[PDB]
Scaffold this active site. Structure first.
Site, mmCIF file in Angstrom:
data_model
loop_
_atom_site.group_PDB
_atom_site.id
_atom_site.type_symbol
_atom_site.label_atom_id
_atom_site.label_comp_id
_atom_site.label_asym_id
_atom_site.label_seq_id
_atom_site.Cartn_x
_atom_site.Cartn_y
_atom_site.Cartn_z
ATOM 1 N N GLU A 1 -73.929 -75.822 -43.549
ATOM 2 C CA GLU A 1 -74.240 -77.234 -43.526
ATOM 3 C C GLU A 1 -75.226 -77.621 -44.621
ATOM 4 O OE1 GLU A 1 -72.913 -79.698 -42.084
ATOM 5 O OE2 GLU A 1 -71.645 -78.725 -40.523
ATOM 6 N N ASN B 1 -73.111 -90.819 -46.644
ATOM 7 C CA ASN B 1 -71.688 -91.004 -46.571
ATOM 8 C C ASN B 1 -71.276 -92.428 -46.892
ATOM 9 O OD1 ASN B 1 -71.046 -88.359 -45.391
ATOM 10 N ND2 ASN B 1 -72.250 -89.104 -43.682
ATOM 11 N N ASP C 1 -69.357 -94.335 -45.145
ATOM 12 C CA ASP C 1 -69.193 -95.130 -43.932
ATOM 13 C C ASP C 1 -70.511 -95.749 -43.453
ATOM 14 O OD1 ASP C 1 -70.499 -92.962 -42.805
ATOM 15 O OD2 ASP C 1 -68.947 -92.442 -41.433
ATOM 16 N N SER D 1 -73.258 -94.094 -42.771
ATOM 17 C CA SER D 1 -74.047 -93.052 -42.062
ATOM 18 C C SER D 1 -74.573 -92.032 -43.051
ATOM 19 C CB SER D 1 -73.249 -92.389 -40.974
ATOM 20 O OG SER D 1 -72.306 -91.445 -41.500
ATOM 21 N N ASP E 1 -76.146 -87.807 -43.023
ATOM 22 C CA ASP E 1 -76.333 -86.528 -42.362
ATOM 23 C C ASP E 1 -77.693 -85.978 -42.811
ATOM 24 O OD1 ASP E 1 -73.620 -86.625 -41.448
ATOM 25 O OD2 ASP E 1 -73.006 -85.847 -43.362
ATOM 26 N N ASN F 1 -75.751 -86.370 -37.880
ATOM 27 C CA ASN F 1 -75.343 -87.688 -38.343
ATOM 28 C C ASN F 1 -75.975 -88.835 -37.629
ATOM 29 O OD1 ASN F 1 -72.924 -89.963 -38.096
ATOM 30 N ND2 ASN F 1 -73.018 -88.958 -40.090
ATOM 31 N N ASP G 1 -73.929 -83.020 -24.719
ATOM 32 C CA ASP G 1 -73.143 -84.267 -24.516
ATOM 33 C C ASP G 1 -71.660 -84.027 -24.631
ATOM 34 O OD1 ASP G 1 -74.911 -86.166 -23.568
ATOM 35 O OD2 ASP G 1 -75.179 -87.158 -25.492
#
Length: 129
Positions: free
Chosen positions: A35, A46, A48, A50, A52, A59, A101
């Protein structure tokens, strides 16, 4: 900070990740390697909206609040800047929440593509612990 492999493995072990939800320590070290290349300051912005953040590239849409991302859930209940610390605690705590989650380690694309199916034990062989 850029961690060494064995130093990160020891830190992760101290924070309870070995065998957390059935994932051995080497899975976590492998995920961090692919990562972020062990860099606690890593950021990937990113298209979009967002971003990271940190050693585990968590994210900003679902997990942490950066104030700039559409659809923010902030399920870890933290600012994303806490994930850019030299101390890994906040990243570990949020990664435990990601698997709690409902998700497994598939939440990390680099784990699925570069760790799954490999000898992950190699990432902690020779260390410490």
């Amino acid at each position: 900070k850029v961690f060494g492999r064995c130093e990160l493995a020891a830190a992760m072990k101290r924070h309870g990740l070995d065998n957390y939800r059935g994932y051995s320590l080497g899975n976590w070290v492998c995920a961090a390697k692919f990562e972020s290349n062990f860099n606690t300051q890593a950021t990937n912005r990113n298209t979009d909206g967002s971003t990271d953040y940190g050693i585990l590239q968590i994210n900003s849409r679902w997990w942490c609040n950066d104030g700039r991302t559409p659809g923010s859930r902030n399920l870890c209940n933290i600012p994303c800047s806490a994930l850019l610390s030299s101390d890994i605690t906040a990243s570990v705590n949020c990664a435990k929440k990601i698997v709690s989650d409902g998700n497994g380690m598939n939440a990390w694309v680099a784990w699925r593509n570069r760790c799954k199916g490999t000898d992950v034990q190699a990432w902690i062989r020779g260390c410490r612990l």
